[PDB]
Design a protein around this ligand. Sequence first.
Ligand code: HEA
Ligand code: HEA
Ligand SMILES: [Cu+2]
Ligand SMILES: [Mg+2]
Lengths: 153, 504, 141, 86, 72, 114, 266, 47, 91, 90, 104, 78
Amino acid sequence: MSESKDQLKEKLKADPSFRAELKDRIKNALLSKVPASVPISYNFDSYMLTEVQPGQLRVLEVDERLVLPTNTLIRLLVTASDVLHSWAVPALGVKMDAVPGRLNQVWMSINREGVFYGQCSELCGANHSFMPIVVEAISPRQFLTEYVKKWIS
Amino acid sequence: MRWLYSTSHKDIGLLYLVFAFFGGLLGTSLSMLIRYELALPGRGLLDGNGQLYNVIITGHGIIMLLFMVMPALFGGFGNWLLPIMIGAPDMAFPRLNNISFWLNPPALALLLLSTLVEQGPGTGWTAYPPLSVQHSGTSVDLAILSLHLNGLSSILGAVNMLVTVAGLRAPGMKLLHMPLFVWAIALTAVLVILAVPVLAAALVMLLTDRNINTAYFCESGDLILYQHLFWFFGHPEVYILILPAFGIVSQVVSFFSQKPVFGLTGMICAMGAISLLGFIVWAHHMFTVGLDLDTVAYFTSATMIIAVPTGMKIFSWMATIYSGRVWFTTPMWFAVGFICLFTLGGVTGVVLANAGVDMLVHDTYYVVAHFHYVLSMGAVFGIFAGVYFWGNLITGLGYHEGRAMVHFWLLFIGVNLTFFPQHFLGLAGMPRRMFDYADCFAGWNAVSSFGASISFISVIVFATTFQEAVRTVPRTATTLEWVLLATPAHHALSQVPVLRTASS
Amino acid sequence: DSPQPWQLLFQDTATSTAQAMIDLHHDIFFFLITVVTLVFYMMFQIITKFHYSKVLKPEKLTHHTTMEVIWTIIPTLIVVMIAIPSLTLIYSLDQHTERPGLTVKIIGRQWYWSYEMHDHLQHKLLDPDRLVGIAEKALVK
Amino acid sequence: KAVYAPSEYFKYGEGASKHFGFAKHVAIAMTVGLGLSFAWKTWHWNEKRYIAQYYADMARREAREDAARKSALADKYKQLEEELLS
Amino acid sequence: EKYSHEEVVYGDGHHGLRKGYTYDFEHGPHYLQPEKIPNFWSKFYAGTGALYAVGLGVPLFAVWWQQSKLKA
Amino acid sequence: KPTLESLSADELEELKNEVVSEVVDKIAGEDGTKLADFLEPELITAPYDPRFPNRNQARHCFVRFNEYYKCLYERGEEHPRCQFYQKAYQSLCPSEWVESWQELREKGLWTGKY
Amino acid sequence: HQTAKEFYMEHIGKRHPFHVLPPSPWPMLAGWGTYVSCLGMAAWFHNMPTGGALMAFGMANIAWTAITWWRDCAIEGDMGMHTEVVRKNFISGMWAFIVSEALLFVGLLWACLHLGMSPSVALQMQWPPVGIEPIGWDKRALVMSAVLAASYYSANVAMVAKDPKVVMGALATTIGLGAMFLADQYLEYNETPFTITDSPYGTTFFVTTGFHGMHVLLGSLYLTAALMMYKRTHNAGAALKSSILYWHFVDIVWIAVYGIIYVGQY
Amino acid sequence: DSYKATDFTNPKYNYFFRELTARVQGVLLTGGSLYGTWLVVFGEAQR
Amino acid sequence: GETIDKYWAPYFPKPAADEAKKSVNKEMVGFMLLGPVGVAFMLYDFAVGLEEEHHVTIPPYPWMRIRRLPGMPWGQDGLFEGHPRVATTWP
Amino acid sequence: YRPLGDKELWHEAWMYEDKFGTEEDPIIVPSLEAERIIGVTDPEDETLVVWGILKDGEPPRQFVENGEFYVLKHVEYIKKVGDVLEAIEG
Amino acid sequence: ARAQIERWAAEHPTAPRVGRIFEVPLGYVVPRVAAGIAAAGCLWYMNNTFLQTYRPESLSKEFLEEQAKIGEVAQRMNAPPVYLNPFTNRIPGSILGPEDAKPE
Amino acid sequence: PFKLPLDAYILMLPITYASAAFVAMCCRVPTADPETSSIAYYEDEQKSAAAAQRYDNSFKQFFDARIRNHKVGVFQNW
Ligand code: HEA
Ligand code: HEA
Ligand SMILES: [Cu+2]
Ligand SMILES: [Mg+2]
């Protein structure tokens, strides 16, 4: 009743195996309070800025950047929709063509935080000059505690 | 009538040379628009029209690759010089030699007419799908048909050259006594025959994709297959354009050094090794398309082996000048300038051949600087070396020596100060085929645009070099075209000369 | 990170792979400097010392087996010395020896870029055994 | 009296190449080229030394916040310890 | 005559100056004799000027043509 | 009163559950809104499949998309392996490719058996 | 004219065994005919009115100039202008042309091998694609193989025979066996359950077999033109040998085409 | 005595094959080239 | 009678009548190995031609009947295509 | 003459003679015109070729050093040796 | 080999043989290549002055002064700003950006 | 045509090496993982993983020890 609860606590005091089993039960119950897995998902476009302010670079500046954590193995799947394009970031040593129907993978890991610029490096029309690339790199704890909370529905 | 119905190889070679000069004028004119648009950041004389800029660079690249260098070296000097050099009275097929020329003004007319149709063919000289397929209208079809006609011209010329070498040689003259120009032209003909029909097949596939709704390079096809076929053609193409330049440099260097060529069999084995290795390294133009690492590994390791025969040829040219009696004239300077400045273009190719380094400089102006070194210092210098060397034999006019040195120095200043800053732009990351760039790239683009104006002025001064000629009587020479009068008769070698081996 | 005015060499790097590429390029430029300097100096000396005002009549030099073998076997060694680091850098482009942490789908359109992601975020109790012991000593008394 | 072919060449060794000194010039060219190459590699090694020091300093900094984070975690653990004992 | 197989095979046995030539290019010692064309240096400079004008003005016309089409 | 020397296994298990829950609801919360300082976030993506070694990874996308519907046909709808396959193809395939594949499945133009 | 043959003997014929041609107008006309037919083909692709008519007009002009050129070549071969070394030059030129055409076919079969071996995700990685019924090897293509091998052996008969009747009969047999190859290919093109717009299988099959069939037609016309010259004088020279070489080249090309497409399902 | 009317290479057929065609085809190609140039330049594609 | 071919004829000798017939027989053995049977089966095939029929309609898969441009240069259906087999309804 | 085996029959021999041209006994080169270009190799190096012009009515002429002397003779017919005299086989 | 050189020199009488490496005197070459470079500079200046339709606003002096005030600093929307190119401008590894520096 | 000079065999060693490498590369492609014209090839996961890992290891296992040792340069740049 209540003494049997107290007798259970006395058996916790006495038997080490029962103590370990109830510790494992405590660990099972604490994992039940852990929130479940949630999906992170986004789909945005990145366009060149037509007019820039001081502190921004003409031709190379976009409106929406790609935010990537540092010290993390990142897979980049590159493809296209209509013609050939090339995703080139010269500071990160990645330049791989975007082919319609292909899914070209890149393994990338960034050493330091910063803002890295790029352009498209495959001729694709009249406005080939005006498809720039900007990658913003932040720390992994910021990425996993603040940035991914912007994409929880 | 004479220039329309000709069967003589000497009239046809002169017609090729005049055509190649016209194509060089067109590509000089198309290249001042490229440098006048790129001089300053923003929008220049093209008013921000990117499709017109793509049309201009496509037409300019195609014209300078196919209607200037090949009609000057392979069609111009080869047709004029090969039967005189080997002692043949004429070509093997004299009327095939006239259709090999007369398929070139139709192809040039189709290519120039595609620019006035719709918005033009802005695709690059490589014409990659699906950008070439996506172009609606007629311009791309006219451009590809122009490439087809020029390829047919090249194949017919190569067949005529290969039969003229093998079967109309002078009596007693084996494949040991022909000059290195003849060996270069023969190897170029072999390369043309083995390489051009693959391009023709790829272009037929491109037309069937554009107009017949077939599935070669499309949604359900494979777009990497086009790059495979086109570059399997295209890497032999750049060696087709440089081997007659090697031959002209050998003939010029051996002439004014008063010496024969150092290492003749080594020279021939090096040209053969260059011709053979050019057919198994085509995929160094495709490092960034997503090939497997083993394929990229092989195509990296096999591309650098091309350095060894070219280095052997350069060192043998230096050994030919070594211990001679050298007299420096305008063709001798264009050969010395060739050997100095082809080495600069060749060493950047070794850098580009390494695939990890090529991931940083692919489709940048580094590549542009590389191939304008090996083509404006390699082929243009070889062409101009032959113009001043054989000019009184071919045309009947001499040249003023002072104005020719003025032209050489204006050209040498102009093209060095044009493409050397493009190395620094390409290392920093300035991409190809763009008419507007970031603000920091302004200085080297201003320097390069200043150099292009000097190159244009050098092109202008070249028309003033010609003057009246002086004619003398020959007695002896080391090649057959220098015992002839200037100009020769219509039937040069009225009697067929024979080569007599000395007795015991 | 960004290009600079009057810049000569590459941009600064943020991956070890890009640094390794630049290191390989500088290693190749080591050999290229020596090759170009040798060519230019020897041609200057040959041009100056064998002018016709210095030479009465030329010598008959057609072949030299030792020098030909020397300039054939020397660049082959340079090529095979350059190639093995280059081959090693090529085969290091796949770095899947870790747990991947992010996937980003990059799509190129006319004329802009599109970025996509669909992953799952899960939480784990950080060092739970200390909390396990804390609960154990909370329940034992 | 016929017409004779004139002498056109010297034998290699007694013309205007005995005074040239080919091996001397090759040694001079190789010394100059290797000097410039070692200057270039010296600059490269200097730049790599600065990069290595940069990343070492960054690791020194990044080890400082993560120690203070675990210190704050232990402080919250010591607070939750007396939260379940009071 | 005038259409026989021998006319096809061995050509027409014309001798001397052809129509307006001042020199025999077919059978004379030189196939090109640019010192015998009357007023040769005027014609050479006119032809070179025409070649320069066309070869430098065709791409300018193609630029003007494509930009006049948009500006409409 | 039933003591520990007389209780059965199921009553003792329920008593253990009550003892654990009544204190861990004070420690962690009934929902778990108190463990935010003691939680470590981690992001899960598609693992490396040894069957797909090349840089072009379109076949990995296609095979995972097909293994999802094979799992859905064979082992129910809520099996953990089917969710693994679903998160695996969602992590690899572009959204345009997937929506084209369901419109081909809805039109009847899917060549799979299931 | 009467002294023109005398001039040729005195200055060209008696000095060397090679043939020197008088001026000719056919290369210029052939080049501008290619220009006209290319403009017509470009107009015919994009469904402009009077474009196919212009393309046919240009192709007819090209064919007429080519026939006039070849008639001049046969006339010069019948006035005895070609010695034995000139005929060997003809054989070597045909060998070079054959090498060019073989590389064109290698480029064509490269695409078949590439597309057939690794089907893409756009085809749902199945080769041949579902809906496409492949043409088998145990049917009419085997009859074509037997017929064209017989044509190979009959052209081999005509090369070594010395009786004019046997040569003319063997040439007619090879020409007739070639025409039976084409009329059966027409039936394959009509009964097949796929078109040129149905998958890369249909694209590669029809483009490769169409180029091979056009080469069969050109070789048969060449052998026919070689037979009529043998019919008149019982002497053909280089026209017979080059045509037999070209026919053998077509027979060799068919082996690769059959083995890749019909057997290999590529 | 070696040529028939059925013979393609008859010397009596040389005027028609070599002289008449050289001007008829010469004017036909001029007419076709001008029309093809106008058609491709000033024409509208319906496909 | 004074042609170039006859003038240079003694300097180009022919490389050396029943051996020709032996070679003709040797090649005709291989000719008759595959000659009559192929002709017989092809003449059989010319009479079993456009008489059979197929009613297998094909679903309009994305790789079937590519129409990147509207129609064909000659018309709507393919050349040499009497009866299209791909479903134009789909259902 | 040299051995005519492995020689083309139309090569106009005299180039296949067994005689070394000396000043007192030169090699007579036949010609259809008053001048003719011939080619002489270097006796110490086969790869070196020198082309020269012989004229009619001139003294004997040497082209390379330590080489043969040559005299041109104007003739109406040049013996196309390979069927002209080895068919005679005297 | 000598006679062909002597033949070429007779057909090119304007080519000097005076015993020096640059046979054409530099008093002829230098003013004319200078005049050519001057004409090229005139053309280049005319392109820079009269053939521009859009000069971008990031090259005006006000933009240049306001950019020189900022320096090579890149902003971030999820983090404090960062120095661009930290190796060629020799930023130490402890400092990431200007706002995170907080000078002593 | 002539006597092959002592150079030409030293040229022919890496030329033969490049030709043999080209032939081996072209030959090993129809024995690779993605060259299968079926979807039922991948439903045997043991065989397909074994085949694709064998396609990874060959011509890369020669470089594993120096990839781990960062032997990515001719010199030793730290
Ligand atoms: C033969 C090849 C050749 C030559 C000579 C040139 C000559 C020049 N080229 Fe170009 N170029 C290409 C081949 C060539 N080019 C190719 C293939 C492309 C790629 C296009 C594409 O990507 O689609 C290209 C593109 C290209 C670009 C890159 C454009 C871009 O990426 O957006 C640039 C940039 O400055 C350029 C500039 C110049 C300049 C200033 C010259 C100057 O040298 C001007 C020329 C001056 C000369 C002196 C050469 C002319 C020669 C003669 C007149 C000799 C003929 C004479 C006789 C026969 C008697 N051209
Ligand atoms: C004249 C034409 C020509 C010639 C001769 C060459 C010669 C070479 N080329 Fe190039 N190339 C082009 C024209 C040419 N190329 C063009 C037009 C493009 C761009 C195509 C496009 O439009 O996209 C291109 C692009 C191109 C690429 C593709 C890169 C890219 O675009 O991303 C590569 C890669 O390997 C390459 C490398 C080489 C090499 C290794 C040589 C070698 O043959 C050079 C060898 C010579 C030397 C190395 C110097 C002499 C040697 C010595 C002095 C010995 C000492 C050397 C060592 C010890 C190493 N070039
Ligand atoms: Cu290349
Ligand atoms: Mg590219």
